[PDB]
């Protein structure tokens, strides 16, 4: 009582039990199977030739026999292609969206347990966050010298997306809450397994449980080159403590957030020398400035102590 999908790169097969797991009101494992097959067919043109036309539309998700026949036809077509080949790149954006959703559906079995009613919740990642994170990746252009940290990483979705798209030395996700941090452990295993199944490359990453406001995390923030933080619902105290942590970052250190940490129009004077605006540039970025999603904006902060230095030089030399 199971369905098996052979890996296009010879990794362990994907095994699903029957009856197939139900994900949410509108998605299930049956549709994930058909979409997986269709993605592999795009990835391998020979496979599309080896597979008969009708097979990827003439199926019945409510029938074991029909689902088994679909799986069989794909498995046999993958077998002939492996026969032809007898004789590790980053995933495309479309495949990655599919992989992240697949990883989530296999990891977060109980969605009520998450208790996230907020916008940008793990449950709606594909609809809201995925495209926005992709636009953010294109805008900040990270290299192998960069270290990326998502402060309050939930189930680790942003970290997985960034690790699958960039060549940062390392990507970290830190989450305090027990339930998301526990789900993140499964997300991590499911992501590595599925990426191996597709034969797709990703950078090194770590998902960990912890408080980003802890003593251990003070020096970790100071050594981070790119911080991602959804500070939208942060209270003044968490916001205050975070600014203190950012104050130890290196020149050129960057912070990508949902609310700015300093005003966009900050003008250094004698009365505001204690403000974070004295040591960081801030710009409002928006995909609307070929975006067709929500009219969102995000904030890029760049550590630059010359703001403070130029002010002191202006006072000594008028
Ligand atoms: C508006 O309602 C709302 N409620 C809550 N709780 N959080 C937010 N957050 C929020 C608000 C706005 S805004 N400025 O248009 O109001 C815009 C974006 C977010 N969140 C984004 C996010 C946060 C930080 C840096 C970002 C970012 O996206 C980025 F990639 F561009 O760089 C998000 N967060 C968590 C996971 C995935 C994603 Cl993608 N928004």
mmCIF file of C-alpha atoms and ligand atoms in Angstrom:
data_model
loop_
_atom_site.group_PDB
_atom_site.id
_atom_site.type_symbol
_atom_site.label_atom_id
_atom_site.label_comp_id
_atom_site.label_asym_id
_atom_site.label_seq_id
_atom_site.Cartn_x
_atom_site.Cartn_y
_atom_site.Cartn_z
ATOM 1 C CA UNK A 1 0.000 0.000 0.000
ATOM 2 C CA UNK A 2 2.466 2.636 -1.284
ATOM 3 C CA UNK A 3 3.611 4.728 -4.278
ATOM 4 C CA UNK A 4 7.265 5.101 -5.265
ATOM 5 C CA UNK A 5 9.018 7.779 -7.350
ATOM 6 C CA UNK A 6 12.499 6.925 -8.648
ATOM 7 C CA UNK A 7 15.075 9.717 -8.354
ATOM 8 C CA UNK A 8 16.283 11.313 -11.663
ATOM 9 C CA UNK A 9 19.903 11.212 -10.281
ATOM 10 C CA UNK A 10 19.792 7.713 -8.729
ATOM 11 C CA UNK A 11 19.222 8.813 -5.106
ATOM 12 C CA UNK A 12 16.886 6.801 -2.787
ATOM 13 C CA UNK A 13 13.258 6.634 -4.159
ATOM 14 C CA UNK A 14 10.465 8.899 -2.774
ATOM 15 C CA UNK A 15 8.054 6.540 -0.949
ATOM 16 C CA UNK A 16 4.458 7.626 -0.171
ATOM 17 C CA UNK A 17 1.914 5.514 1.766
ATOM 18 C CA UNK A 18 -1.601 4.911 0.426
ATOM 19 C CA UNK A 19 -4.074 6.449 1.373
ATOM 20 C CA UNK A 20 -1.966 9.492 0.497
ATOM 21 C CA UNK A 21 -1.534 12.181 3.200
ATOM 22 C CA UNK A 22 -3.922 15.168 3.042
ATOM 23 C CA UNK A 23 -2.126 18.421 3.488
ATOM 24 C CA UNK A 24 -4.674 21.275 3.669
ATOM 25 C CA UNK A 25 -8.238 21.893 2.335
ATOM 26 C CA UNK A 26 -6.906 22.444 -1.247
ATOM 27 C CA UNK A 27 -3.559 20.525 -1.466
ATOM 28 C CA UNK A 28 -2.665 16.815 -1.051
ATOM 29 C CA UNK A 29 0.206 14.371 -1.691
ATOM 30 C CA UNK A 30 -1.453 13.217 -4.947
ATOM 31 C CA UNK A 31 -1.025 16.671 -6.560
ATOM 32 C CA UNK A 32 2.520 16.900 -5.133
ATOM 33 C CA UNK A 33 3.319 13.571 -6.967
ATOM 34 C CA UNK A 34 1.964 14.810 -10.374
ATOM 35 C CA UNK A 35 3.722 18.215 -9.974
ATOM 36 C CA UNK A 36 7.018 16.473 -8.965
ATOM 37 C CA UNK A 37 6.827 14.290 -12.131
ATOM 38 C CA UNK A 38 6.021 17.377 -14.272
ATOM 39 C CA UNK A 39 9.026 19.280 -12.736
ATOM 40 C CA UNK A 40 11.430 16.337 -13.413
ATOM 41 C CA UNK A 41 10.075 16.255 -17.052
ATOM 42 C CA UNK A 42 11.065 19.975 -17.430
ATOM 43 C CA UNK A 43 14.501 19.321 -15.852
ATOM 44 C CA UNK A 44 15.132 16.370 -18.276
ATOM 45 C CA UNK A 45 14.002 16.818 -21.949
ATOM 46 C CA UNK A 46 14.810 13.111 -22.811
ATOM 47 C CA UNK A 47 12.257 12.091 -20.079
ATOM 48 C CA UNK A 48 9.484 14.134 -21.773
ATOM 49 C CA UNK A 49 10.293 12.196 -25.010
ATOM 50 C CA UNK A 50 10.353 8.799 -23.163
ATOM 51 C CA UNK A 51 6.950 9.521 -21.497
ATOM 52 C CA UNK A 52 3.650 9.197 -23.457
ATOM 53 C CA UNK A 53 1.597 12.456 -23.866
ATOM 54 C CA UNK A 54 -1.667 11.489 -22.009
ATOM 55 C CA UNK A 55 0.001 10.116 -18.765
ATOM 56 C CA UNK A 56 0.351 13.495 -17.016
ATOM 57 C CA UNK A 57 -3.407 14.497 -17.436
ATOM 58 C CA UNK A 58 -5.316 11.155 -17.653
ATOM 59 C CA UNK A 59 -5.020 10.140 -13.953
ATOM 60 C CA UNK A 60 -7.418 9.809 -10.980
ATOM 61 C CA UNK A 61 -6.013 10.994 -7.609
ATOM 62 C CA UNK A 62 -8.815 9.048 -5.839
ATOM 63 C CA UNK A 63 -7.669 5.703 -7.327
ATOM 64 C CA UNK A 64 -4.702 3.676 -6.102
ATOM 65 C CA UNK A 65 -4.471 1.750 -9.424
ATOM 66 C CA UNK A 66 -4.458 5.015 -11.491
ATOM 67 C CA UNK A 67 -1.857 6.698 -9.240
ATOM 68 C CA UNK A 68 0.284 3.530 -9.318
ATOM 69 C CA UNK A 69 0.103 3.447 -13.183
ATOM 70 C CA UNK A 70 1.201 7.119 -13.360
ATOM 71 C CA UNK A 71 4.133 6.372 -10.979
ATOM 72 C CA UNK A 72 5.042 3.200 -12.968
ATOM 73 C CA UNK A 73 5.093 5.073 -16.357
ATOM 74 C CA UNK A 74 7.392 7.777 -14.847
ATOM 75 C CA UNK A 75 9.630 5.151 -13.128
ATOM 76 C CA UNK A 76 10.004 3.196 -16.401
ATOM 77 C CA UNK A 77 10.682 6.384 -18.381
ATOM 78 C CA UNK A 78 13.381 7.328 -15.754
ATOM 79 C CA UNK A 79 14.771 3.750 -16.215
ATOM 80 C CA UNK A 80 15.118 4.125 -20.081
ATOM 81 C CA UNK A 81 16.801 7.549 -19.616
ATOM 82 C CA UNK A 82 19.264 6.008 -17.121
ATOM 83 C CA UNK A 83 19.798 3.258 -19.820
ATOM 84 C CA UNK A 84 20.506 5.996 -22.460
ATOM 85 C CA UNK A 85 22.977 7.692 -20.034
ATOM 86 C CA UNK A 86 24.838 4.344 -19.465
ATOM 87 C CA UNK A 87 25.434 4.269 -23.286
ATOM 88 C CA UNK A 88 24.372 19.266 -9.336
ATOM 89 C CA UNK A 89 23.287 22.842 -10.142
ATOM 90 C CA UNK A 90 21.150 25.267 -8.109
ATOM 91 C CA UNK A 91 17.370 24.740 -8.664
ATOM 92 C CA UNK A 92 15.393 27.062 -10.976
ATOM 93 C CA UNK A 93 13.078 29.512 -9.078
ATOM 94 C CA UNK A 94 9.962 27.460 -10.104
ATOM 95 C CA UNK A 95 11.461 24.156 -8.928
ATOM 96 C CA UNK A 96 12.619 25.767 -5.650
ATOM 97 C CA UNK A 97 9.096 27.049 -4.858
ATOM 98 C CA UNK A 98 7.821 23.476 -5.433
ATOM 99 C CA UNK A 99 10.654 21.940 -3.292
ATOM 100 C CA UNK A 100 10.065 24.380 -0.363
ATOM 101 C CA UNK A 101 6.307 23.612 -0.415
ATOM 102 C CA UNK A 102 7.017 19.848 -0.613
ATOM 103 C CA UNK A 103 9.514 20.083 2.304
ATOM 104 C CA UNK A 104 6.879 22.034 4.332
ATOM 105 C CA UNK A 105 4.048 19.510 3.584
ATOM 106 C CA UNK A 106 6.249 16.563 4.648
ATOM 107 C CA UNK A 107 7.446 18.392 7.824
ATOM 108 C CA UNK A 108 4.485 20.373 9.243
ATOM 109 C CA UNK A 109 1.868 17.620 9.668
ATOM 110 C CA UNK A 110 -0.219 19.528 12.287
ATOM 111 C CA UNK A 111 -0.697 23.194 11.182
ATOM 112 C CA UNK A 112 -2.896 24.200 14.211
ATOM 113 C CA UNK A 113 0.170 23.444 16.448
ATOM 114 C CA UNK A 114 2.135 26.343 14.787
ATOM 115 C CA UNK A 115 -0.494 28.937 15.980
ATOM 116 C CA UNK A 116 0.459 31.586 13.385
ATOM 117 C CA UNK A 117 -2.400 33.912 12.292
ATOM 118 C CA UNK A 118 0.084 36.656 11.314
ATOM 119 C CA UNK A 119 0.893 37.705 7.696
ATOM 120 C CA UNK A 120 4.078 35.942 6.372
ATOM 121 C CA UNK A 121 3.261 32.881 8.554
ATOM 122 C CA UNK A 122 4.973 29.526 7.542
ATOM 123 C CA UNK A 123 1.533 28.276 6.344
ATOM 124 C CA UNK A 124 1.318 30.934 3.538
ATOM 125 C CA UNK A 125 5.049 31.046 2.577
ATOM 126 C CA UNK A 126 4.502 30.119 -1.080
ATOM 127 C CA UNK A 127 1.826 32.773 -1.629
ATOM 128 C CA UNK A 128 3.351 35.733 0.226
ATOM 129 C CA UNK A 129 7.055 35.274 1.106
ATOM 130 C CA UNK A 130 8.635 33.158 -1.683
ATOM 131 C CA UNK A 131 8.488 35.834 -4.448
ATOM 132 C CA UNK A 132 9.464 38.626 -2.035
ATOM 133 C CA UNK A 133 12.457 36.620 -0.687
ATOM 134 C CA UNK A 134 13.499 35.940 -4.375
ATOM 135 C CA UNK A 135 13.386 39.685 -5.204
ATOM 136 C CA UNK A 136 15.394 40.414 -1.986
ATOM 137 C CA UNK A 137 18.045 37.774 -3.016
ATOM 138 C CA UNK A 138 18.375 39.514 -6.491
ATOM 139 C CA UNK A 139 18.731 42.951 -4.787
ATOM 140 C CA UNK A 140 21.387 42.235 -2.116
ATOM 141 C CA UNK A 141 23.716 40.026 -4.321
ATOM 142 C CA UNK A 142 25.531 37.960 -1.611
ATOM 143 C CA UNK A 143 28.976 36.351 -2.221
ATOM 144 C CA UNK A 144 31.067 33.487 -0.666
ATOM 145 C CA UNK A 145 32.442 36.074 1.856
ATOM 146 C CA UNK A 146 28.926 36.655 3.290
ATOM 147 C CA UNK A 147 27.357 35.051 6.400
ATOM 148 C CA UNK A 148 23.552 35.175 6.402
ATOM 149 C CA UNK A 149 21.402 35.072 9.571
ATOM 150 C CA UNK A 150 17.578 35.082 9.840
ATOM 151 C CA UNK A 151 16.739 36.315 13.415
ATOM 152 C CA UNK A 152 13.514 34.512 14.376
ATOM 153 C CA UNK A 153 13.602 32.002 11.495
ATOM 154 C CA UNK A 154 10.332 30.144 12.274
ATOM 155 C CA UNK A 155 10.457 26.702 10.579
ATOM 156 C CA UNK A 156 13.522 27.867 8.540
ATOM 157 C CA UNK A 157 11.898 28.636 5.157
ATOM 158 C CA UNK A 158 13.823 31.909 4.448
ATOM 159 C CA UNK A 159 17.158 30.172 5.319
ATOM 160 C CA UNK A 160 16.315 27.200 3.003
ATOM 161 C CA UNK A 161 15.400 29.545 0.108
ATOM 162 C CA UNK A 162 18.543 31.729 0.534
ATOM 163 C CA UNK A 163 20.808 28.622 0.961
ATOM 164 C CA UNK A 164 19.310 27.123 -2.255
ATOM 165 C CA UNK A 165 19.852 30.402 -4.165
ATOM 166 C CA UNK A 166 23.148 31.941 -2.963
ATOM 167 C CA UNK A 167 26.789 31.004 -2.439
ATOM 168 C CA UNK A 168 27.086 32.534 1.182
ATOM 169 C CA UNK A 169 29.757 30.782 3.248
ATOM 170 C CA UNK A 170 26.963 29.843 5.744
ATOM 171 C CA UNK A 171 23.268 30.571 6.428
ATOM 172 C CA UNK A 172 21.847 30.483 9.944
ATOM 173 C CA UNK A 173 18.337 30.355 11.267
ATOM 174 C CA UNK A 174 17.768 31.094 14.995
ATOM 175 C CA UNK A 175 14.283 30.540 16.502
ATOM 176 C CA UNK A 176 13.288 30.829 20.206
ATOM 177 C CA UNK A 177 9.838 29.128 20.198
ATOM 178 C CA UNK A 178 9.888 25.327 20.844
ATOM 179 C CA UNK A 179 7.171 24.289 18.296
ATOM 180 C CA UNK A 180 8.676 26.112 15.164
ATOM 181 C CA UNK A 181 12.280 25.160 16.175
ATOM 182 C CA UNK A 182 11.210 21.466 16.482
ATOM 183 C CA UNK A 183 9.474 21.572 13.050
ATOM 184 C CA UNK A 184 12.703 23.240 11.691
ATOM 185 C CA UNK A 185 14.622 20.011 12.582
ATOM 186 C CA UNK A 186 12.292 18.043 10.269
ATOM 187 C CA UNK A 187 12.415 20.836 7.580
ATOM 188 C CA UNK A 188 16.235 20.521 7.613
ATOM 189 C CA UNK A 189 16.181 16.673 7.083
ATOM 190 C CA UNK A 190 13.351 16.890 4.489
ATOM 191 C CA UNK A 191 15.166 19.677 2.573
ATOM 192 C CA UNK A 192 18.512 17.791 2.365
ATOM 193 C CA UNK A 193 16.672 14.557 1.331
ATOM 194 C CA UNK A 194 14.506 16.233 -1.401
ATOM 195 C CA UNK A 195 17.424 18.303 -2.777
ATOM 196 C CA UNK A 196 19.423 15.060 -3.104
ATOM 197 C CA UNK A 197 16.394 13.364 -4.800
ATOM 198 C CA UNK A 198 16.237 16.148 -7.490
ATOM 199 C CA UNK A 199 20.090 16.333 -7.616
ATOM 200 C CA UNK A 200 20.113 20.030 -6.689
ATOM 201 C CA UNK A 201 22.879 22.040 -5.007
ATOM 202 C CA UNK A 202 22.505 24.312 -1.943
ATOM 203 C CA UNK A 203 24.943 26.206 0.244
ATOM 204 C CA UNK A 204 25.729 25.204 3.868
ATOM 205 C CA UNK A 205 23.120 26.137 6.466
ATOM 206 C CA UNK A 206 22.175 25.551 10.151
ATOM 207 C CA UNK A 207 18.734 25.810 11.803
ATOM 208 C CA UNK A 208 19.010 26.180 15.584
ATOM 209 C CA UNK A 209 16.877 26.862 18.652
ATOM 210 C CA UNK A 210 17.897 29.944 20.659
ATOM 211 C CA UNK A 211 17.359 33.545 21.776
ATOM 212 C CA UNK A 212 19.019 36.016 19.375
ATOM 213 C CA UNK A 213 19.106 38.529 22.303
ATOM 214 C CA UNK A 214 21.388 36.176 24.386
ATOM 215 C CA UNK A 215 25.079 36.828 25.263
ATOM 216 C CA UNK A 216 26.236 34.034 22.907
ATOM 217 C CA UNK A 217 24.299 35.756 20.063
ATOM 218 C CA UNK A 218 25.886 39.245 20.746
ATOM 219 C CA UNK A 219 29.197 38.318 19.017
ATOM 220 C CA UNK A 220 27.363 36.171 16.439
ATOM 221 C CA UNK A 221 25.339 39.246 15.298
ATOM 222 C CA UNK A 222 28.588 41.371 15.345
ATOM 223 C CA UNK A 223 30.211 38.840 12.914
ATOM 224 C CA UNK A 224 27.157 38.550 10.579
ATOM 225 C CA UNK A 225 27.413 40.334 7.216
ATOM 226 C CA UNK A 226 23.698 39.982 6.214
ATOM 227 C CA UNK A 227 20.892 39.970 8.836
ATOM 228 C CA UNK A 228 17.283 39.221 7.812
ATOM 229 C CA UNK A 229 14.751 40.163 10.500
ATOM 230 C CA UNK A 230 10.970 40.395 10.453
ATOM 231 C CA UNK A 231 10.798 43.105 13.150
ATOM 232 C CA UNK A 232 7.313 44.258 12.101
ATOM 233 C CA UNK A 233 5.620 43.180 15.403
ATOM 234 C CA UNK A 234 8.648 43.811 17.727
ATOM 235 C CA UNK A 235 8.020 45.855 20.884
ATOM 236 C CA UNK A 236 10.189 48.917 21.773
ATOM 237 C CA UNK A 237 12.339 46.816 24.165
ATOM 238 C CA UNK A 238 13.234 44.060 21.633
ATOM 239 C CA UNK A 239 13.769 46.837 19.006
ATOM 240 C CA UNK A 240 16.076 48.714 21.517
ATOM 241 C CA UNK A 241 18.110 45.555 22.389
ATOM 242 C CA UNK A 242 18.466 44.697 18.652
ATOM 243 C CA UNK A 243 19.847 48.186 17.815
ATOM 244 C CA UNK A 244 22.457 47.623 20.597
ATOM 245 C CA UNK A 245 23.448 44.300 18.905
ATOM 246 C CA UNK A 246 23.596 45.965 15.433
ATOM 247 C CA UNK A 247 25.861 48.705 16.932
ATOM 248 C CA UNK A 248 28.693 46.062 17.113
ATOM 249 C CA UNK A 249 28.440 45.082 13.366
ATOM 250 C CA UNK A 250 31.268 45.674 10.862
ATOM 251 C CA UNK A 251 31.346 48.465 8.188
ATOM 252 C CA UNK A 252 29.239 47.308 5.222
ATOM 253 C CA UNK A 253 27.215 44.936 7.430
ATOM 254 C CA UNK A 254 23.621 44.774 6.184
ATOM 255 C CA UNK A 255 20.207 44.410 7.788
ATOM 256 C CA UNK A 256 17.079 43.532 5.740
ATOM 257 C CA UNK A 257 13.915 44.184 7.722
ATOM 258 C CA UNK A 258 10.142 44.854 7.448
ATOM 259 C CA UNK A 259 10.220 48.136 9.492
ATOM 260 C CA UNK A 260 13.256 50.513 9.434
ATOM 261 C CA UNK A 261 15.497 50.616 12.529
ATOM 262 C CA UNK A 262 16.422 54.267 11.828
ATOM 263 C CA UNK A 263 14.492 57.025 9.911
ATOM 264 C CA UNK A 264 14.980 57.114 6.125
ATOM 265 C CA UNK A 265 15.484 60.924 6.487
ATOM 266 C CA UNK A 266 17.886 60.783 9.531
ATOM 267 C CA UNK A 267 19.903 64.011 9.924
ATOM 268 C CA UNK A 268 22.730 63.775 12.506
ATOM 269 C CA UNK A 269 22.773 66.685 15.018
ATOM 270 C CA UNK A 270 23.960 67.410 18.584
ATOM 271 C CA UNK A 271 20.697 66.078 20.115
ATOM 272 C CA UNK A 272 20.502 62.635 18.394
ATOM 273 C CA UNK A 273 24.136 61.307 18.701
ATOM 274 C CA UNK A 274 22.912 58.216 20.629
ATOM 275 C CA UNK A 275 20.622 57.080 17.745
ATOM 276 C CA UNK A 276 21.475 54.099 15.487
ATOM 277 C CA UNK A 277 20.939 56.489 12.477
ATOM 278 C CA UNK A 278 24.430 57.917 13.260
ATOM 279 C CA UNK A 279 26.074 54.613 12.087
ATOM 280 C CA UNK A 280 23.805 53.214 9.319
ATOM 281 C CA UNK A 281 22.396 54.122 5.918
ATOM 282 C CA UNK A 282 18.753 53.070 5.347
ATOM 283 C CA UNK A 283 16.875 52.689 2.036
ATOM 284 C CA UNK A 284 13.317 51.585 1.275
ATOM 285 C CA UNK A 285 13.183 48.891 -1.379
ATOM 286 C CA UNK A 286 10.101 47.664 -3.177
ATOM 287 C CA UNK A 287 9.611 45.152 -5.970
ATOM 288 C CA UNK A 288 6.965 47.577 -7.419
ATOM 289 C CA UNK A 289 9.781 50.083 -8.307
ATOM 290 C CA UNK A 290 7.666 43.005 -13.419
ATOM 291 C CA UNK A 291 6.071 42.574 -9.919
ATOM 292 C CA UNK A 292 2.345 41.762 -9.655
ATOM 293 C CA UNK A 293 2.165 40.607 -5.969
ATOM 294 C CA UNK A 294 1.268 42.695 -2.806
ATOM 295 C CA UNK A 295 2.353 46.398 -2.647
ATOM 296 C CA UNK A 296 5.148 45.583 -0.151
ATOM 297 C CA UNK A 297 8.325 47.376 0.822
ATOM 298 C CA UNK A 298 11.381 46.289 2.832
ATOM 299 C CA UNK A 299 14.303 48.123 4.413
ATOM 300 C CA UNK A 300 18.002 47.765 3.704
ATOM 301 C CA UNK A 301 20.366 49.128 6.438
ATOM 302 C CA UNK A 302 24.093 49.368 5.795
ATOM 303 C CA UNK A 303 26.543 49.921 8.679
ATOM 304 C CA UNK A 304 28.509 53.065 7.817
ATOM 305 C CA UNK A 305 30.364 54.851 10.676
ATOM 306 C CA UNK A 306 31.492 57.643 8.279
ATOM 307 C CA UNK A 307 28.077 59.262 9.006
ATOM 308 C CA UNK A 308 29.241 59.780 12.625
ATOM 309 C CA UNK A 309 32.871 60.515 11.587
ATOM 310 C CA UNK A 310 31.881 63.287 9.059
ATOM 311 C CA UNK A 311 29.710 64.974 11.740
ATOM 312 C CA UNK A 312 32.629 65.121 14.230
ATOM 313 C CA UNK A 313 35.024 66.325 11.466
ATOM 314 C CA UNK A 314 32.480 69.082 10.525
ATOM 315 C CA UNK A 315 32.481 70.307 14.193
ATOM 316 C CA UNK A 316 36.326 70.403 14.486
ATOM 317 C CA UNK A 317 36.775 71.875 10.960
ATOM 318 C CA UNK A 318 33.920 74.355 10.074
HETATM 319 C C1 LIG B 1 1.806 43.881 7.042
HETATM 320 O O1 LIG B 1 1.618 42.801 7.983
HETATM 321 C C2 LIG B 1 2.728 42.141 8.533
HETATM 322 N N1 LIG B 1 2.635 41.429 9.682
HETATM 323 C C3 LIG B 1 3.722 40.807 10.210
HETATM 324 N N2 LIG B 1 3.626 40.125 11.373
HETATM 325 N N3 LIG B 1 4.907 40.855 9.553
HETATM 326 C C4 LIG B 1 5.010 41.562 8.408
HETATM 327 N N4 LIG B 1 6.185 41.606 7.755
HETATM 328 C C5 LIG B 1 6.429 42.250 6.580
HETATM 329 C C6 LIG B 1 5.905 43.533 6.294
HETATM 330 C C7 LIG B 1 6.297 44.184 5.118
HETATM 331 S S1 LIG B 1 5.640 45.789 4.767
HETATM 332 N N5 LIG B 1 6.984 46.701 5.050
HETATM 333 O O2 LIG B 1 5.260 45.814 3.373
HETATM 334 O O3 LIG B 1 4.676 46.159 5.769
HETATM 335 C C8 LIG B 1 7.176 43.571 4.208
HETATM 336 C C9 LIG B 1 7.672 42.292 4.471
HETATM 337 C C10 LIG B 1 7.312 41.633 5.665
HETATM 338 N N6 LIG B 1 7.762 40.398 5.971
HETATM 339 C C11 LIG B 1 8.790 39.690 5.221
HETATM 340 C C12 LIG B 1 10.210 40.268 5.411
HETATM 341 C C13 LIG B 1 10.729 40.643 6.670
HETATM 342 C C14 LIG B 1 12.047 41.156 6.795
HETATM 343 C C15 LIG B 1 12.873 41.365 5.666
HETATM 344 C C16 LIG B 1 12.308 41.105 4.400
HETATM 345 C C17 LIG B 1 11.048 40.535 4.294
HETATM 346 O O4 LIG B 1 10.709 40.338 2.970
HETATM 347 C C18 LIG B 1 11.944 40.666 2.302
HETATM 348 F F1 LIG B 1 12.380 39.590 1.639
HETATM 349 F F2 LIG B 1 11.620 41.587 1.378
HETATM 350 O O5 LIG B 1 12.971 41.232 3.170
HETATM 351 C C19 LIG B 1 8.860 38.226 5.664
HETATM 352 N N7 LIG B 1 8.760 37.926 6.983
HETATM 353 C C20 LIG B 1 8.882 36.652 7.452
HETATM 354 C C21 LIG B 1 9.148 35.585 6.571
HETATM 355 C C22 LIG B 1 9.250 35.850 5.190
HETATM 356 C C23 LIG B 1 9.134 37.177 4.755
HETATM 357 CL CL1 LIG B 1 9.255 37.508 3.058
HETATM 358 N N8 LIG B 1 3.918 42.164 7.889
#
